[PDB]
């Protein structure tokens, strides 16, 4: 209901169950979960994609429930963590897409406004990550190194 | 965004009390509400109340007996001296024959009279009577 950039007050989300431990009917092994997680990561799918695919295809509810640890942490321990966190990278991708659209057709002004919103969000998130020190303290997002990080 | 969960708890309490209800659902349910309600209950404004686990922040549901009249929270938890206690008692409580200013002490959560007999004083939380 916050929705920083739009007065929308929705609460669309998920309520994960109360049982911290695994469901009683699950037959897969926590380790085998770990190896399939790592191989899908080798395929390149982001941990959100990893979670959704493991929920759709297999009895994987929450990898934290099963393996006792969370997907990004599994990747970090296994040394498959991306240099840029996925949500941030998606923000750069969206921002550069909007930038390309805007430069393509000038007069669109709501495009410019949404670009300002996206840059506000991306600066905010980068500030957070720098405080937690995931990013280098000199990591900066403006236009051109932005395009390089798009690659 | 929600800022002081204790204020929301007491606001729900006052709203549901004024309407004449008997039970209240406190949503965020942090330590301070629990201590507040034990102080309340041992004084008697509240009956046998209840905590609920939620794997996240829990919940409270509290029984009333209509004994209460009004509660409230002094959200900016002001630094009170051992002297300035009388100032708050005069400015908040109806009459010193009863009423209780609730403040956090080096001992812990505590009403004003307990604070004066223990000869300790800290930050003020709320006022009930």
């Amino acid at each position: 209901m916050g929705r920083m950039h739009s007065k929308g007050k929705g609460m669309s989300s998920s309520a994960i169950p109360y049982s911290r431990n695994a469901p009683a009917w699950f037959k897969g092994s926590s380790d085998g979960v770990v190896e399939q997680i790592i191989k899908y990561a080798r395929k390149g799918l982001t941990p959100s994609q990893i979670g959704v695919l493991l929920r759709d295809a297999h009895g994987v509810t929450q990898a934290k429930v099963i393996t006792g640890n969370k997907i990004l942490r599994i990747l970090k321990s296994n040394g498959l963590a991306p240099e840029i966190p996925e949500d941030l990278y998606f923000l750069i991708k969206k921002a550069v897409s909007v930038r390309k659209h805007l430069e393509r057709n000038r007069k669109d002004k709501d495009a410019k406004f949404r670009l300002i919103l996206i840059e506000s969000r991306i600066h905010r998130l980068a500030r957070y990550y720098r405080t937690v020190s995931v990013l280098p303290p000199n990591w900066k997002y403006e236009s051109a190194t932005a395009s390089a990080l798009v690659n | 965004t929600r800022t002081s969960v204790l204020a929301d708890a007491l606001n729900a309490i006052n709203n549901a009390e004024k309407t004449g209800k008997r039970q209240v659902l406190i949503r965020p349910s942090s330590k301070v509400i629990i201590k507040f309600l034990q102080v309340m209950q041992k004084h008697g404004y509240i009956g046998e109340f209840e905590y609920i686990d939620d794997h996240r922040s829990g919940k409270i549901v509290v029984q009333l007996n209509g004994r209460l009249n009004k509660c409230g929270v002094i959200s900016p938890r002001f630094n009170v001296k051992i002297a300035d206690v009388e100032k708050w008692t005069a400015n908040l409580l109806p009459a010193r024959q009863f009423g209780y200013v609730i403040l956090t002490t080096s001992a812990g959560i505590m009403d004003h009279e307990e604070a004066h007999r223990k000869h300790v004083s800290g930050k003020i939380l709320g006022f009930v009577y």
Partner: protein, 144 residues
């Protein structure tokens, strides 16, 4: 609610914001700006000695008609010129123009009392002696 800050560490604004809103009270603005020292020929003085020039009659407003016997005077302390009122019945002909007269306030904190437009001040002492002393036949004008 009550759209002023309430956190412990907000003190600054609660001061400076008040330090702004105080500029609304005219009393406070006059006191800090010292407008009583540039305008208002009494430089903060409750009394001043001036020299009378001419005796004038001033009309009154709508509900009240009468010729108020006012009097022009130039103040020694600054040289400015003001108009004053003679506060008893038979006292205009006590002024004896080109006379030292002591002017006081006029009962409304630098405003115009009642139905006498364009004046701000009483008259208390004429030729040293107080005017009410003359009007009570207790003392007499020196005529010097």
């Amino acid at each position: 609610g009550k759209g002023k800050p309430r956190g412990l560490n907000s003190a600054r604004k609660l001061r400076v914001h008040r330090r702004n809103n105080r500029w609304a009270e005219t009393t406070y603005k006059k006191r800090l700006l010292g407008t009583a020292f540039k305008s208002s020929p009494f430089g903060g003085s409750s009394h001043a000695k001036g020299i009378v020039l001419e005796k004038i009659g001033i009309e009154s407003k709508q509900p009240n008609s009468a010729i108020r016997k006012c009097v022009r005077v130039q103040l020694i302390k600054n040289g400015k010129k003001v108009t004053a009122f003679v506060p008893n019945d038979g006292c205009l002909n006590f002024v004896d123009e080109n006379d030292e007269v002591l002017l006081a306030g006029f009962g409304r904190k630098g405003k115009a009392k009642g139905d006498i437009p364009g004046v701000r001040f009483k008259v208390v002492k004429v030729s040293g002696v107080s005017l009410l002393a003359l009007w009570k036949e207790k003392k007499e004008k020196p005529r010097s």
